[PDB]
Symmetry: C2
Subunit: 376 residues, 2 copies
């Protein structure tokens, strides 16, 4: 039929690997094998693979293998089954014969699932990729976490639905930089470039790739290996790896939209301010809630209104000695920036009420946020 396979694996190890790879599997597929995990047993290693064609996750666990072989079975169902199996039970996986089903058993339970042959499972090439670049896991987390919120989810601009990862020579030192924008704001984060990074092309890593890599990163060791080409990116975590296409598109010329000479400098207590904004925004249940900042020496007055004659106002003392002005922002966009500020202060740099505004982190010079004002 499709050969044979027979092994046992600890539930915890099986569950870990299934949980790692299943996430990439879409909840619908007109192509049924894309709903499946590829199981490949050899030696003392059970390998796992899943894909949505844009990316592939692979993982591996220890197994006791009586008969080596390969098969595919439905990802979600297999995962959900294994979740319900008793804690500590060893799980037998096997199939054989002319009308094979994947047989899962543990304790007094037996499940049979339909299978598709391993030879029909998609193959994701690694051709063209750079050599592996060791990246500090925590630095890689930082690049993602400081910028991820500003990635577009708008179907109408596919080229903004990813994170632009590239190297920059910033006045004699090479930086690995991440930029995300949705056209309504922008986030930038960078680090001194890892050794061996210089040479890689600038790529737009898809937003789902970012999500999946970020989740796998949370449990990785000190290093994540990165490989890049103009077509592909690959993250190696140890036992798990994620290989993905990049977005074939031009990322905007983002340096043009980051203001360099904003001269009105305002410093504030980030937590206090964010709490104020969130508080006043609570007057409204709308999606795109606006907040007005009335800035004067020593203070900012925040105002939000709803459509039903409700009003909220709060005064926040700040460090500012310039000329007064009013400016409007989308409250969520503002709050997103505040949530990424690393220390007690945030520094706003304004020009005039129609101009892009810069936010700087006194703790971390390697991040830069841009907010676009709303007509007030």
């Amino acid at each position: 039929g499709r050969g044979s396979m027979k092994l046992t694996i600890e539930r915890a190890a099986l569950l870990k690997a299934l949980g790692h790879v299943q996430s990439v599997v879409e909840r619908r597929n007109t192509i049924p094998i894309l709903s499946n995990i590829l199981l490949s047993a050899e030696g003392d290693r059970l390998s796992f693979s899943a894909t949505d064609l844009d990316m592939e996750i692979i993982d591996e666990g220890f197994a006791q293998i009586d008969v080596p072989g390969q098969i595919t079975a439905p990802a979600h169902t297999l995962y959900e089954i294994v979740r319900k199996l008793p804690d500590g039970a060893d799980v037998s996986l096997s199939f054989s014969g002319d009308d094979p089903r994947l047989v899962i058993q543990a304790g007094r339970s037996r499940f049979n699932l339909p299978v598709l042959p391993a030879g029909d499972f998609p193959v994701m090439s690694s051709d063209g990729l750079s050599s592996r670049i060791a990246v500090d896991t925590n630095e890689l987390i930082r690049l993602i976490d400081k910028t991820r919120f500003a990635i577009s989810t708008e179907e109408t601009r596919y080229y903004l639905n990813g994170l632009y990862v590239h190297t920059v020579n910033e006045g004699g030192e090479t930086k690995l930089r991440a930029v995300a924008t949705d056209g309504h704001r922008l986030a930038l984060a960078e680090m001194p470039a890892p050794e061996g990074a210089v040479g890689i092309p600038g790529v737009i890593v898809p937003r789902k790739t970012i999500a999946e890599a970020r989740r796998l990163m949370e449990s990785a060791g000190e290093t994540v290996d990165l490989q890049v080409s103009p077509q592909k990116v690959r993250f190696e975590f140890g036992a798990a790896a994620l290989t993905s296409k990049v977005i074939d598109g031009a990322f905007p010329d983002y340096m043009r939209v980051i203001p360099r000479d904003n001269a009105k400098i305002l410093t504030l207590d980030n937590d206090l301010f964010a709490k104020a904004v969130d508080r006043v925004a609570t007057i409204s249940a709308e999606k795109s809630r606006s907040v007005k900042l009335a800035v004067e020496p020593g203070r900012i007055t925040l105002t939000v209104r709803n459509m039903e004659a409700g009003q909220a106002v709060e005064e926040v003392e700040v460090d500012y000695d310039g000329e007064p002005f009013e400016i409007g922002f989308n409250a969520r966009y503002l709050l997103d920036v505040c949530g990424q500020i690393a220390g007690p202060q945030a520094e706003f740099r304004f020009a005039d009420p129609a101009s892009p505004t810069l936010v700087v982190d006194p703790v971390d010079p390697g991040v830069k946020y841009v907010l676009m004002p709303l007509r007030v």
Copy 2:
């Protein structure tokens, strides 16, 4: 405009009372005052009321009142505001003048909400209600928790969308009994009748009333006071009370659908069995998942299938020495019963595969569950 009011109240007390009454307020209302809470300040007491016309919740907290008065303001918005106010802050509530708004302030925040006059707020009469009947809070919780799952949520049978609360003379002793059914199963729970209960009419308490009463009960003292009429029910918790219409309809003759002579008696380990059922059901993501019980002396074999050639089977040892048979149940209906069994054993009483099945709790003779079999 609508008079005046001026008070201060501790945030925690304001938040507690708002949280208690807001739950009854529907998320939409074509009649705007039904979206509002009635605030009534007098002496050192701020009273709170909200309603959906079917029921009214009232609560009260301590306040320092400078100017007594009454007003209504939007329930959800007021609650959400108060949630965001700083922990420990005293909250000022006030209004006055020709174009009044409810002014809420705490710390450096000020909110203005639109108001409607207190004289337009609906009045819920307590006329016709019995005298207060003291009920043990934990017994009242038990009546609800053991039966609530079997209340209908089907729009097509409004008379099953509540809990039938009534007294019964069960061979010389009066019982307060709760019965719920959706026509697909049934749950019954009873207790020795509280002193003063005999005399009350049988009423169908609406499902949303049950939900709301049950939530308020969780923090009550040792007693909840109950009053009943053919039109209304009222729960008094202490500071809070819930007054509600009852469902104007005939509850089914439920004694006819509870089997009395089922002779095939099967005893099982409830937790083990429920875990088995849940495990095998996990083969399927369908709504109305069926499970087959193949019963023989000493054992039950459980089988579930999905629509995609998947199968799950588990054997559970049980105490049974009768003749073998197969029977089908909705897995969720079965699991609902198992979740209410109080101790390690559950006792099933079967007749034949087409007959209603009884479940008995060896720990608690005051509950009775009925499951209706599916054609297998």
